[PDB]
Every structure is written in C-alpha cells, then in structure tokens.
Amino acid sequence: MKVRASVKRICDKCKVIRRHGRVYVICENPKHKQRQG
Amino acid sequence: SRIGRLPIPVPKGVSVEVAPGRVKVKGPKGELEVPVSPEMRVVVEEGVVRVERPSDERRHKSLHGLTRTLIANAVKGVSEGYSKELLIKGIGYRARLVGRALELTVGFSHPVVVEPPEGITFEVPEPTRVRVSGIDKQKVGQVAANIRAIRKPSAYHEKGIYYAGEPVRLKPGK
Amino acid sequence: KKVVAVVKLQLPAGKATPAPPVGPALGQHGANIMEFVKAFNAATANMGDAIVPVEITIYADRSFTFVTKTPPASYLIRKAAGLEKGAHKPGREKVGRITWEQVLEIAKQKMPDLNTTDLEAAARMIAGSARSMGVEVVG
Amino acid sequence: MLMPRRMKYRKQQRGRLKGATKGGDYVAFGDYGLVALEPAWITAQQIEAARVAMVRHFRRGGKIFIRIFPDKPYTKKPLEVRMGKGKGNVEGYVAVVKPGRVMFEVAGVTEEQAMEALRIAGHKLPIKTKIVRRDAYDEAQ
C-alpha cells in the first residue's frame, strides 16, 4: 500500500474510488494500490 | 442506465411482504430479510415489485438502485439459490466433509475445519473442489471468501485455494 | 519426429545461414537448412537482395514446404537513387529524388502483395516508403 | 535566473500587496497562459524552476513567454543577529504578482502540451493559479 496525501491513477488500468473519507486507488497491479493519509 | 427504476419481476411462488424498515422475501427454498431505507418506497403489486424514490437527488439515487438490487437478489435467492465453487491446487492439498463441516489440509501442521453457519451447506465432490451453496447471496460470498482466506493462492506457484474462474497469475522466481 | 507447427516468421531473401532465428524456430523442424538460401536467394534474385520471409510447414516425418515473394519496399528504393539508410531527419529532407513514374516501376514487382491491382494505389504505396526515408516526388 | 542588470537603488521598502493586478491581465503573446489567483512575491528561483519545467516539456518545439520580471530586491538580516544596525543585505530578487496577472504564456504547442506544461509550472509557485486560453476578450484589450 502507498499511503500519501495525493493519490492518483498511476496506469490507465488504475481506478480511483472514495473509501472511508480518504481517496483510494485500486488496480490489478498491487504496486498502484494507494490510500490517502 | 438506472437499476432501481427497473421493476422487480416476482414469480408465482416467491412473495414480498413490506414491513417497517425491511421487506420479507419468502420463496421455494427458504426465507430472507432485506433491510430497506425508511425513506424509500417499496410497492408490491400483481406479480411485480417496484421501488420508487422520493427525490432524485444523489443520496436517494444511491439508495434507489441498492434497494431494488437487494430485493431482486433475494427473489433469485429463495428461488434458485446461490452457490460459489472453490478450486484446490497444490501437490498435497485436499478437502473432505465431516459434518457438513469442511476439513482442509492445505499445508499447515494441523488441518483446519470450517463449521458452516445457518443455511450455506458444504459439498465436497472431488477432493480438490468445494462448493458453498445457500439462498443468502451475501453469505455464500462471505463463507466462500472465508474458505479461500485459509490459504490464498501463491504469488509464485499454482498452490492454495482458488475461486473457480480465478486466473492463476504467477510472477517469476529465480 | 517433431509436430506440425505453422511457421509464420520473418526472414530475409539473402541473409541466409543457420544463425538465429535460423535454429530456434526451425528447431521444431528437420529440413534442409540451406534452402531458404539456395532456392530463395537464387530464383527471386532478379529484384536484388534484401528481406523477404518464408512460410514453411513441418510434418512429423521431417517435411518442409515453403513459398515467398519480394524484397521490402524500403529496399526497392535503395537501388533507386543510391540510399542505404533513410535521411535520418526527413519531413523536410529531400536527399534522393524520383519521378511519378520512376516511382511507377517499383510496384511492377511488389504488385502481388497488397490488394491494389491498380498501380496508382500501389504507386503512392511504394511512394509512401519514400517519405519515411525522405526521397521525394518531383512536381 | 533573472535579475536587473543595474538599479538606481539597492534596497527598497516592502510595500503592500493590495488590489487586482494593474496590468498584464490578458494573454498577449501566446495561445495559453498561467494567471495568478493570489498575490505574492514570486522569487527568481521560482520563475527559473517554472521556466525549466515547461522547457523540459517542450524538448523540441515551443515558445515560452515569461511576462513577470523580478525587479524588487529581497532583503534579509544575517542569521543570529539582533534587531538594528541597518537594513539587511540583498539576498535575491522577487516579482510582485497580484491576482489576474498573466505570468507565463506558451505558444506553438498542442493544447495538451500547453495545459500540462502550465500545470507543472503552477506546482512550482507559492500561489494558486488558473490556466487560460487566448480569448476574444484578450484580442479586444
């Protein structure tokens, strides 16, 4: 998991969702999994 | 577009009973209780159930499709029922029933047994295939996931417990 | 005794000896290796040299069978006005130059390859290989 | 990075930062621009970092117009020094930017290139900014 203030798509297969207030990225590449923090 | 405003076809046999805060969905294979937001409207008529929203602002559109899908999921449940199927891989991993209680030997020093909750039911045809199958769609999904979690698939070898259909996606070693 | 692999590849009419990929793909094989040399570098030598692949079929009792064609439109343009590269920086670079019918001959050979039996759609064809090496079409 | 070639005076008073920008509020030379939304002393090092970022983005093609110039000298006392003994030494130059000002303009460049080069360049400045596209309203000015 990548925990950051600015979470964003990294590749086009990345998808941006909202989860428990923080902005999330999920993707089929686990390196791109981010939650805001 | 728009799920919620699609009317729910209710077959003869199953039936939907609107109570405070939920709808009772009863059918051939059992009974299910569907919590419904109080500020939604569930209309039960001649062989059709329909959900209608008070406003078409965004919290209401979100509760709209949710309700209609949750009720349709219960119509299908008490009607066909739901199942998921689990694949076991790995040069020694096996399943067997004693219960109906799943018993997994998946590489630990002990074998782990899973006791199924109400409904649900376990079927072990082949020793490398398990089936969860109840009328509650969300708790077939739940117990199916519970079982996989015992031994998720390996990043490196076709080993562990798999959803049927789940692609094996390995990454290289040395 | 190797299986019946369908042999789509990419080889050259001339550059022909068992250095890779002559070996890896034609591993699943057993054919006369120096035949894509022999028959192909000779019978289609009138045009010149250069790259054309080859479509073989292996059968289990070591059987070969292959047909081919024409050096690449970027060769038939290297004899043209003396090139052996492009022009590195085209789009403005007009090194060699050709006429609308000195680039009508070059499709006399690659004609049976596209779908255009019209040497107008087969002229601007080989004349499109012009720009990606920079040689012009005068007035 | 930019500084005036010569100055009548080396040190000058801070001034206020009031009002919308006085001029330079319309795209005047290029196709797109970056305009300031808040006032600030934008330092030369900042301007240089914004310029280079867009340059790097135009490695082949493009014109960059820098329409703000750091003519205001910036003063700072030496560290660990008590108050008094005169005004600090010039340690740099700033440009006074008020909201509405067009600070950079790009031309000769696709829309995507232009709004990406200006977006990075904004990230280099201490102020919120807005990317704008030459209008009939600029032409009328």
Binding site: - | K174 | - | P78, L79, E80, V81
Partner: protein
C-alpha cells in the same frame, strides 16, 4: 565466480557446461585507478570493460567510503580512467563541537571559533597523508 551459480539458477538446474581454453583475443578494456585523498592506491588498481567499469568503479568508491578511517579532515575517494575521475565519494570530517559553551548570543563569538576550525581543516587537508588500513583492503577485496 558468479557464472556457474547463475547458469544453475536461471535453469532450475538442468543447464550443463564445459569448456576448454581456446586462446586469447583483443578486448576493449580500460585501466581504472583508485585514489584515496588524492594518492593512487596501487593495491586497488584493476581492469574492466568500458561497458561495465563505471558500475565497477561506482561500487568500490562507495565501499571504500564505508571503511576508510574517518579523519580530522574530509577525505575524497575517487576512480579515474587514466587522468579523468569518473566516480567520487567523500569520507568525513571528524570535528570538534567548537560552539559547545556558546550561550552568549553574540554571533561574532561563534564565528571566531568557526573561522579558526575552517582554517585548520584546510591545513590538515593539505598535508594530511591518509593510509588505508589492511583491515579496509580485506573489506573491499572479499
């Protein structure tokens, strides 16, 4: 070293090897010199292929940085392909906290002690012959 191990590992063991001498041959090889604190350490002169030597030099320079005896002056560590340095690392610079009793407040009193130290490090840098310990050679040459 290295090859046989990697032959075995990328091939899950099934790759074999054999060889025989087959002579000599020209190579595009460079002499890489290693100087510590400006003096060429012959003991560490090696020779590599220009495709790799930087990555070789980028390595020894830094391992030597981690094992050289930190001096009273900052010690440069360098690698040169004949008269041109290509990889640089620096050892500290052990120093005295000359400002330790400085709760006066006056910056001039910190400057006075700081100037003197800066001047002294210059002097100890210029005439400072560092020797590499035999414990460092073994550390770089494993």
């Amino acid at each position: 070293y290295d090859f046989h191990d990697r032959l075995k590992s990328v091939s899950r063991g099934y790759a074999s090897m054999d060889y025989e001498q087959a002579g000599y041959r020209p190579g595009d090889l460079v002499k890489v010199n290693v100087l510590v604190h400006g003096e060429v350490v012959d003991a560490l002169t090696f020779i590599a292929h220009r495709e790799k030597a930087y990555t070789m030099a980028r390595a020894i320079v830094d391992k030597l940085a981690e094992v050289i005896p930190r001096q009273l002056f900052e010690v440069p560590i360098q690698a040169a392909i004949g008269g041109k340095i290509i990889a640089r690392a620096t050892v500290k610079a052990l120093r005295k906290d000359v400002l330790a009793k400085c709760y006066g407040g006056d910056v001039t009193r910190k400057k006075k002690l700081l100037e003197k130290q800066k001047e002294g490090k210059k002097r100890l840098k210029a005439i400072g012959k560092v020797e590499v310990p035999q414990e460092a050679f073994l550390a770089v040459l494993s």
